[PDB]
Amino acid sequence: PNYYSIEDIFVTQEKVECRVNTKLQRMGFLDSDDLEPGRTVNLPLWYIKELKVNNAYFTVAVPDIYRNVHKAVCEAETTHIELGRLHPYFYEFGRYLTPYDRNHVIGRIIFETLRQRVRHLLDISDNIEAKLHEAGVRTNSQYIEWLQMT
Amino acid sequence: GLEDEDDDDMEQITAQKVLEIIETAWINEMCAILPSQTDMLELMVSQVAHMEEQMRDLDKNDFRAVVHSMELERVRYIMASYLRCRLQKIETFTQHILNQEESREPDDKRLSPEETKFAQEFASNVDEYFHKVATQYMPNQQRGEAEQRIVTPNLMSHVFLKANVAVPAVIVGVDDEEVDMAAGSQHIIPYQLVADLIQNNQAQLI
Amino acid sequence: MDPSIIEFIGEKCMISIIPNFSNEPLHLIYGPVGPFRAGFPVFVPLWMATHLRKQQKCRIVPPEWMDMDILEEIKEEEKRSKFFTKMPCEHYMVVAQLVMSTAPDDVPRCEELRTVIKDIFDIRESKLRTSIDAFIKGEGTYAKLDNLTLLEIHSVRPILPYSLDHIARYQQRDTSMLS
Amino acid sequence: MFGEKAFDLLKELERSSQTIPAFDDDGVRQVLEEIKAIFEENVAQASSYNASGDRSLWPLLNFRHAALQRNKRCLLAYLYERCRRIKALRWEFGPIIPGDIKQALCEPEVTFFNNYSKSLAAYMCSAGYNQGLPIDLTNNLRPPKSLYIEVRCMEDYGKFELDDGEVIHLKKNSQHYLPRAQVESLVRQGILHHI
Amino acid sequence: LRNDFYRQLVGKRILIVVNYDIDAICASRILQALFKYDHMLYTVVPIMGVTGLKRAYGEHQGDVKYVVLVNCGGCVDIVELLQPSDDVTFFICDSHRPLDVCNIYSDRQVCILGDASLEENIPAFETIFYDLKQRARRQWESERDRIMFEYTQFSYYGRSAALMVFELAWKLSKDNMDLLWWAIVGITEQLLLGKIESGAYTLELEQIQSHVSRLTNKTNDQNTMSASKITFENDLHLVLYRHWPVTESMRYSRYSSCQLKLWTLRGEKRLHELLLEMGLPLVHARQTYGAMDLVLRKEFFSMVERLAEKYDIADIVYGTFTLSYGYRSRYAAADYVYALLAIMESVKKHKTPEDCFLEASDALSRQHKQLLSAGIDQAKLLHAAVFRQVQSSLEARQVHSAGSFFYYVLQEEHAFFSYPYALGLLARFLLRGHVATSRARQASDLPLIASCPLNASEGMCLLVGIVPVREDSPRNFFGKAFEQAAQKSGVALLQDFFEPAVVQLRQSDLTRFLDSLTV
């Protein structure tokens, strides 16, 4: 039901600990029928992918690498910042996330990083870039024989 | 009644010309069904058969045997390629293409029957193999050919445009900026927006 | 996007060559061709010279852009190529392959030829890394074909567009941006 | 756990890459026998007045949906993934030479197999002629020569050659007085350095 | 003449490429090409012995009637062996030369490429296949003075395998300079008077010369890199001049070793005392020629040709060819044949022999040239593992005289020597050592016999034969000699190989075989 994904059990399952405005009832999986306003409440996404973002249950919040504290300088530090493989879904958290937290501020950032690649892969001669990267090597490797049988 | 065109008519549409008259229907299908014709099933199997029987007459030569043969081959790996592609296109797009077919019953221009026999072959294999995947206690409300399954609603094959039309800025249908057209240059786009010029074949593809 | 996709294409082009035997065991294949006479040149598509030069049958000399001075002048003509330049047949980088493969067993100077054309190919493609360092800001409606050739654009065809899609997810809402 | 297990399926194809001795149907068994067992997990409050349709089974209804979701699409894959490399060999041969094993056949996989073999039938009726010819697409594009000389190969295996021959022993030196009518089967599945 | 026959070759066919030889691929790869030239698909054979004949062909009981014969013919009245012939034509281009007249006639199923100024064997059909009794035997035996002088005295081989095909083909608008190199491969394969005689070598100084000293189809503009046509010069067939230093030749060469006695010391002092006269340095005498400085490398042969006149080696100047493709190299035709035998590797996989045959036939292409380097490597070490028995033998004297010949036995095998033809070489390296040199020639000029330890194949006493030297052209009694004990007793003997001079006994039934064979 998706622009599908390889890790459909790690696709919407990376976890965040948003606080709470109001009371709780019977979490089931957790140590739970009522808990506090404001708590480190572990929250693996999928159920809250469409769970009434406007409602008085949860608040403005971020896992703070995804907060401006890193990234809003990673747009100034967009020069030789490395990402490795770390927080992997980092071209793509916001493809869901960005409004859903409803801090109206970080839509620019991810684009601002990855539109850099219009001038990263001139010198080229995450879990998603892997495909196109392989392809970039491959097409030239076969353009090699587009010369000849070589 | 309306004869005397460069189609298979009362004249010679050259093997090297007939090479052209079907060439772009292949070269477009890369960078994206575009409207399909079963007419070639009358054309190619006929024309090549005539040369085939001529070669079946001229199966004694060394040379022209081989020339007609190499010709045939260079013609034939593309006629392979067409459905070598389209089977993928709708094996992929078995999902919601039937919406288009129940919208318009697309005529000889657009679709073809055997494609729509893939509807049979699809639902048969999928549901009768699913018959042993999850049918013991199969679904409760979304029990049929399911809701969520689609291959390609993205009309977004971002595409290079073969400029071969009016070298002045012939401004035409596209939902992004269309200013400043010409016979060489281009304003690159996706497929979503020009379903128009190539249904006209006004414009072209690289 | 392939090595022989072009060779399904470029050898379709036809040029005046020499045959050195006359019309074959059959006289003429019907089509644009006329029949064959030794010592009398004939224009044909180029996917026969395979079956002549490898068959030890006849020679061929090329078109005229396939020579020294014209290309030793286009080498400076493309100074204007801040878009593009002169285009002698727009496939001289593919034909030259199969030409210079077997033809130059008898042809004069297959080398300065080879030298300049490699000296022209990649250098026109350096344009295509550099001019891409001009490309910014979702410019779908900006591009360049004006005198592009045939053999190059495939070498970027597979990559950026299958990137630029899930860019183009972002290339209505409130003050913040949307995709 | 809830299906993290296609990550396990990736190594089922290991020797079976381009040197495939035989393949295996496994990784699935109780992985299937859980799924409608845990329909009970999915059915437990299903239309139950335990809560009369209220908050506490909305969030994991979605789980009941999620559990469904990951079920079906890996179940697309579990043969679709297998149908792709199939299709390569299965263009490399029509109904001349089906699978070397047919031993990891997910038992009604023939349902898809023949039907897939018969999706080509559409193409087949149109291919070759309007009535159709099962057409040469993948093999022996020698500019073909005379019919009756023997063979050499590069250690093909399976010995599934259904074409009109006495006994060829489809390996390197499958070599007997072999006509063309037999030898029209296979090319690049371990075979053709040479004739 | 096959100007009439060749044009029949359009139907189905087989291109056998016969039992083990370099001659095979030389005179066939030409035609593995030419088949797809006529739009003919080709089909080929690995052969190791007459063993292989019908265990391969018997799998192919058809009638494909355009058929090869090379390196065989001294086999059977070939209808009697190849009986499924009803009119199935054969085509012979065999070098296994001395053939019986049973095999030519019934002249439907063979083709006689035999024409010579030696008309001496006519009534053999009027004797054998035709034969009062007393006079019949009078004819029989008094003319077997000539007939049994054939096929019961000695044996030899003739002429090329595809120089005939060259003679056909230079007319057919084909100037495959590469294939002229291939011809030279076949030349120094066995036409080398060092191996088997030409004599007329000195008049093929004209032959292929006049083919190509004729022909420079670019006589005016020939200064390009690829496929520059080849050039004649008076050169050597000394051992592997090119990639190893001079001192390697000066050690591993026989025509020094037969005349200069190099494995000992005075050979070396004397060598130095000639490198004085050349005045070459010693570093420079121990770097690869391609590695040395230049003017010495350049001026080498210019001096060596002349002021080697005086020092017991008369016969170092020869006539040869050598070329490259471009800028990596300058190969030499003689710098290849000793590389050829390097993939003839007798490993215990059962895969090695035939697939190495395919490898070698994959080798003579310009496209396939990486591997040849490894062959050169192997050959050098082989040539220096020769010594691994020489000084240990020639000073220990394993030598056995054993009557009117000389007798040798090795009793421990080498993975080097699982491949057999080493057995010819070491004989032709060492009889020189003592049995020629520490004596006059009177105890030198007799042939020699060489045991072959089979440490791998269960013990079967493999063999090859040898001549006396400086009179080589007098054909080998060993063509017959070893039938002696075979004829007197016979002991588990086989002649399973194509060759006469090759046999296989039991590991431990060889001495009484000798005492029979002593005579």
Swiss-Prot record, chain C:
Query: Pfam families annotated for this entry?
Result: PSF2_N (PF25005), Sld5 (PF05916)
Please state where this protein is localized. Nucleus
Gene Ontology CC annotations of this record: CMG complex; GINS complex; nucleus
InterPro entries in alphabetical order:
GINS_A, GINS_bundle-like_dom_sf, GINS_Psf2, PSF2_N
Its keywords, alphabetically, are:
DNA replication, Nucleus
* Top-rank lineage group of the source organism: Eukaryota
> Quaternary form?
Component of the GINS complex which is a heterotetramer of Sld5, Psf1, Psf2 and Psf3.
Protein function: The GINS complex plays an essential role in the initiation of DNA replication.
UniProt name for this protein? Probable DNA replication complex GINS protein PSF2
Q: Which species is this UniProt entry from? A: Drosophila melanogaster
Q: Taxonomically, what lineage is the organism?
A: Eukaryota, Metazoa, Ecdysozoa, Arthropoda, Hexapoda
What's the name of its gene?
A: Psf2
